[PDB]
Design a protein around this ligand. Structure first.
Ligand SMILES: CN[C@@H]1[C@@H](O)[C@@H](O[C@@H]2[C@@H](O)[C@H](O[C@H]3O[C@H]([C@@H](C)O)[C@@H](O)[C@H](O)[C@H]3N)[C@@H](N)C[C@H]2N)OC[C@]1(C)O
Lengths: 192, 98, 61, 171, 51, 106, 199
RNA sequence: UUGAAAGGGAAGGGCUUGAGAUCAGACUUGGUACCGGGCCAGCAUCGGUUUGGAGCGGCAGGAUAAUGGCGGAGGAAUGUGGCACGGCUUCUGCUGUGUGUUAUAGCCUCUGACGAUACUGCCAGCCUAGACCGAGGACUGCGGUUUUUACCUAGGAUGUUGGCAUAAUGAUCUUAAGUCGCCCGUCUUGAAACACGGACCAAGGA
RNA sequence: ACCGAACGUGAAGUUAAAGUGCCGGAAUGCACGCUCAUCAGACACCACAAAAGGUGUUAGUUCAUCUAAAUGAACUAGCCCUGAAAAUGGAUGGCGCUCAAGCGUGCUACUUAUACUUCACCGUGAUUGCUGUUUUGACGCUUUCACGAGUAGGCAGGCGUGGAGGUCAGUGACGAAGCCUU
């Protein structure tokens, strides 16, 4: 909690100091995306079909966390007309994990109802609690691979309030697919 | 969980008895009941045993006395209590204050 | 729906019991199922799977 | 309310040849910041031979109206594409904000020329400060001394389906 | 046998996150930030308005 | 007096339905004098009675009731959805129902 | 919006189709409706255009036997009835029962000449059409396509209006007298106390 | 033939409910006036899921909102007062045109110090209206409160009250209403087909 | 064969594509314009229209003439009109609709799929544990998770018929078998 507060305030101070010193502060690029599949399972060309499989997005309204790199960015690029993604806030991650967080324990979807379940499977990566897991996801940490893969793909509902009139076109052209970049949080509140 | 009510039995014809809060509309008209003694009415008082026990009639007279002492202070309150409520044409309970 | 990444409802493809109806072979399977369940010696598990094998998979020694 | 005015500032990514590449700014009318940065890169890729992947967005900022409750007249210069060709045009609008005038312009070009949002470039939006600058009679007629006009034939909106009294349109 | 939502169930919230007691006790969710009043844009940053 | 009513008048309008498929388990009800979802939310949870007459006496009476309750609002014009112990028969499309004032929260 | 026993609509100045849709939904929902003065209905568009439309309607007839074809009714109330029946599922029992709740008339026959008539603002021509747009009166259109009783209805309506005006003069005199009597009893205790209640 | 029922250019079917008929069940293998149970419901509280309110409040950001209000300087016109020229008003909003810069109205630009609001986000803040569900069946776990080898909202519904058992209740059959429903088998890229076999029933039939 | 979405049996919630004047669940909802047709127009695939004209109306472009009260030329592209003729009577699906219920565009809410979310139940596959309590079913019992469309075709587990060995010291003239029957 303390380091979340100090990171927010330090960025605010930097943005203010840049204005005074006749400079422009540029934020660090986002390191994390949350990707939601919003297309059904029929009539998908093979390459994006394989990409969606490799992202563990095999149903509609499934969601996973992804660490942004050139490799994964080009992966998501291939899945763009079938997913909505953006940069999750800390509270979005917390709410997703608390309400719809499940672990893969011996190939089984197991509810994260106790810290023992997390410590037994990820404690060897020094994750002892649900807050440790949330911290590891939000700050794209050293054991992000193991923590993200231990989480079962999030199984969201349809949005309370619906999508835009037509989904399957980019967020920029008034649809619902692609990178919407901070409005992923409003969509998760609708669907979670 | 029930409510203890009286007519008073003289004004309305309805005695001391229990009613359920969900089957009542609570209006904004109030009677000062600091002067009524209701310290001996409880669930056991309506335990099941026409003919009415002299206990119940005596209690009804006693409570009616204090209530009528207090009800007469508000003009038209006794006549209002004597009259039955009904919904007229154009009466919308979502718009109506009680 | 689901975009399945593997065939659904596939049986394990391994024999889990002797096809035989010899009651004494079943007694041996019972003993070695207990042994493989309660002892965690690898040998007992190997013996248990061997008791399931068909004739051509148990060549004479 | 459909739109906001943004400044978007970007530059080329620094290299060894050019440690301090030149900052560029655009005034963009967009529904949100995602579209604003998209439009910035669209115009930078037209005007200059740059791409999004070899550049970066430096700042995105709302530009609020200076006097939101002062009545103004705006001239807007536009480039739009028709079914048949590409045209320049200049139109005038009355409003209290630049965003209101731009929204009205988008409605007007949709209505009279069937020009969708994707077909229009906003060259320039200028608050016309002298009444002599107002060129179009469809806005000029609201700039006359002691303008007053009635609103004949008022239609009252009814809550009920059946009215017990005859209609009136007085006002 | 039954999953309980910690954002709804206070007890399950405390079971998963002991710190939720201190977060509420210290009013972290509504903490005043102590600072002064400055306008770092009163100069060149006012090229936001016009060039 | 001469008016004794304690219920609000209503009508059985329809079942929940799409264009071609109806759902008899949910009825759409028009409450008199209610024109918006805001007004209709006063009646959520109120009990509904459909009172009808039948040829044969039961307990010396020819009056029979189907009980239900208001569950949620429907649309933008103040209609509500209702759930009855037994689905209202479709011949009662256009018939009147009785919206009680209980369970009361006033 | 209230449930009435019978709603009697004065058809004068109402647009055909808008009134028809409103009435159709009313009768489907269990409300009895009577529409009077159907010859005073309106249709948007100039007269000649609606006459052309009716003649295109007349052109449709069963080839092998004209007696089986569409039956083209000419009276204005039947023109409104055709508009309404097209908005009803009239081939079902429920649709038939809905149509039984409807009555339509030229003029204002008894007993509806002594009953209150209402209007439907969502369908009123003076409230809907743009002020310069041309419109048709259904009574003229009916007479142009074979309706035979325009002049009879006009004569009877004149007689009804004479009687109704005399009725109204009496009611106005009575109301004036009653207003004087209520003015004589103002500033009373009851009058002041009612005034404190908004009445 | 008898009885019952339905019937506006086919009939027949599914789903749902009503109506009429039939069937069934706990006052139990009940126990000894009492105990206790069965069924149908009302209310209360809890747990799970979920939709709401004109919701209320705290905090953060931004141009440390922009405005506005207040103070200061500068300016002009769709030029107020004043003044002059007039065609019409017995200057009975008369009126119009000119002039110039607050006058007997005001406006615009820039700016100084305070104070808000909008928008966006956060609260492990508060209050409040409804709906559906109640799987499991000694205990065992994790936590909490601690005032306790205790108690809890924390490993899945209990409490209470009324009615009924000559029945409120459930199933089936017949029929009405609403909605949907082309004739099967076959060859075929494609069958309701203006493609073929099939009037009906039994027994035989690969 | 398009769009959406692929299907065990259910409850509640939310949606996709498509819609919300009536037929039909959902607004005669909020908003800026455009259009009047004596063959208007009305939603992808898709149930067609061209070259070419208009002083109908709207908005634009570039020139020019005017107090030494605005006007003149050329042009651009929106909706509308002409170009636009077939045989039974007839199809924006119908009604009908004209500051639309039409065309372009923005917004708010709302409607409902066998799809998504939570829960119940069936089955399939996997999975946890079970012998000093293994207890006459260990081919059994038990914990947990995921999944379920299907012609040709494969396999599994069952239902039914004639006759044969064994068993129930089985049923039966006090009524076997057959047949009819809310
Ligand atoms: C905007 N593009 C238009 C397209 O909309 C359409 O135009 C129709 C035009 O064909 C119609 O006009 C045409 O068709 C009608 C009728 C047969 O529909 C005839 O009566 C008329 O004579 C004929 N010119 C006109 N009444 C409306 C336009 N939108 O046809 C193609 C087009 C001309 O390019």
């Amino acid at each position: 909690q303390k380091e979340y507060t100090e990171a927010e305030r330090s960025v605010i101070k930097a943005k203010r100091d840049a204005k005074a010193s006749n400079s422009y502060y540029v934020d660090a690029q986002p390191k994390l995306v949350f990707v939601v599949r919003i297309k059904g399972i029929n009539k998908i060309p093979p390459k994006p079909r394989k990409v969606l499989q490799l992202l563990r997005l095999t149903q509609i309204n499934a969601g996973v966390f992804v660490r942004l790199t050139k490799a994964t960015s080009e992966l998501i690029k291939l899945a763009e007309p079938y997913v909505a993604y953006g940069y999750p806030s800390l509270s979005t991650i917390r709410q997703l994990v608390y309400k719809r967080g499940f672990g893969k324990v011996n190939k089984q979807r197991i509810a994260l109802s106790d810290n023992a379940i997390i410590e037994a499977n990820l404690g060897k990566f020094n994750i002892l609690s649900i807050e440790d897991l949330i911290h590891e996801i939000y700050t794209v940490g050293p054991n992000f691979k193991q923590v993200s893969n231990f989480l079962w793909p999030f199984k969201l509902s349809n949005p309370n309030g619906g999508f835009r009139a037509r989904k399957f076109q980019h967020f920029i052209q008034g649809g619902d697919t692609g990178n919407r970049e901070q409005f992923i949080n409003a969509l998760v509140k609708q669907m979670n | 969980n029930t409510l203890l009510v009286s007519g008073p039995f003289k004004v309305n014809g309805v005695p001391l008895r229990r009613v359920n809060a969900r089957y009542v509309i609570a209006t904004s008209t109030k009677v000062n009941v600091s002067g009524v003694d209701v310290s001996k009415f409880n669930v056991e008082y309506f335990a099941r045993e026409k003919e009415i026990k002299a206990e119940r009639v005596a209690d009804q007279k006693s409570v009616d006395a204090a209530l009528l002492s207090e009800i007469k202070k508000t003009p038209l309150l006794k006549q209002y209590l004597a009259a039955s409520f009904s919904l007229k044409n154009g009466d919308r309970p979502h718009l109506l204050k009680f | 729906g689901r975009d399945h990444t593997s065939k659904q409802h596939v049986r394990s493809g391994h024999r889990t019991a002797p096809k035989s109806d010899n009651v004494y072979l079943q007694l041996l399977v019972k003993l070695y199922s207990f042994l493989a369940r309660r002892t965690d010696a690898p040998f007992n598990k190997v013996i248990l799977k061997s008791l399931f094998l068909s004739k051509i998979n148990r060549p004479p020694v | 309310s459909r739109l906001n005015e943004y400044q978007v500032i970007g530059r080329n990514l620094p290299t060894e040849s050019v440690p301090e590449p030149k900052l560029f700014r655009m005034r963009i009318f967009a529904p949100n910041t995602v579209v604003a940065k998209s439009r910035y890169w669209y115009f930078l890729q037209k005007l200059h031979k740059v791409k999004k992947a070899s550049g970066e967005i430096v700042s995105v900022n709302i530009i609020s109206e200076a006097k939101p409750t002062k009545v103004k007249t705006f001239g807007i210069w536009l480039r739009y594409e028709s079914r048949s060709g590409i045209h320049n045009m200049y139109k005038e609008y009355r409003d209290v904000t630049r965003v209101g005038a731009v929204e009205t312009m988008y409605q007007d070009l949709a209505a009279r020329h069937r020009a969708r949002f994707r077909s229009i470039h906003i060259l320039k939006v200028v608050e016309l400060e002298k009444t002599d600058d107002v060129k179009r009679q469809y806005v000029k007629q609201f700039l006359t001394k002691d303008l007053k006009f009635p609103l004949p034939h008022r239609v009252q909106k009814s809550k009920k389906l059946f009215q017990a009294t005859a209609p009136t349109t007085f006002y | 046998v039954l999953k309980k939502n910690p954002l709804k169930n206070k007890q399950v919230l405390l079971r998963l996150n002991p710190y939720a007691k201190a977060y509420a006790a210290e009013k972290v969710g509504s903490a005043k930030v102590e600072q002064a009043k400055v306008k770092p844009s009163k100069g060149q940053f006012a090229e936001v308005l016009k060039n | 007096a001469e008016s004794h009513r304690l219920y609000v008048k209503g009508k059985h309008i329809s079942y929940q339905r799409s264009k071609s498929v109806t759902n008899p388990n949910v009825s759409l009800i028009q409450i008199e004098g209610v024109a918006s979802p805001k007004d209709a939310k006063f009646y959520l949870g109120k009990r509904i009675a459909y009172v009808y007459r039948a040829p044969k006496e039961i307990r010396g009476s020819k009056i029979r009731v189907i009980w239900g309750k208001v569950t949620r609002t429907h649309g933008n014009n103040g209609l509500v959805r209702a759930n009855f112990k037994k689905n209202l028969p479709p011949k009662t499309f256009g018939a009147s129902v009785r919206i009680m004032l209980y369970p009361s929260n006033i | 919006s209230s449930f009435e026993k019978v709603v009697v609509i004065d058809g004068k100045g109402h647009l055909l189709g808008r009134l028809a849709s409103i009435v159709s939904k009313q009768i489907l929902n269990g409300q009895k409706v009577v529409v009077v003065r159907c010859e005073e209905l309106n249709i948007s568009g100039e007269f000649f255009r609606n006459k052309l439309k009716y003649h295109d309607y007349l052109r449709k007839a069963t080839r092998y036997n004209k007696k089986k074809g569409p039956f083209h009714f000419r009276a204005p109330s039947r023109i409104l009835y055709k508009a309404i029946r097209g908005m009803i599922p009239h081939k079902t029992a429920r649709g038939k029962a809905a149509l039984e709740r409807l009555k339509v008339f030229e003029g204002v026959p008894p007993p509806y000449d002594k009953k209150k008539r209402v209007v439907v603002p969502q369908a009123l021509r003076v409230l809907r059409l743009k002020p310069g747009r041309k419109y048709t009166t259904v009574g003229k259109l009916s007479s142009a396509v074979g309706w035979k009783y325009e002049s009879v209805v006009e004569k009877l309506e004149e007689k009804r209006k004479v009687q109704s005006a005399e009725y109204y003069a009496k009611k106005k005199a009575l109301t004036k007298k009653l207003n004087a009597a209520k003015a004589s009893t103002a500033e009373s205790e009851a009058a002041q106390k009612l005034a404190a209640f908004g009445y």
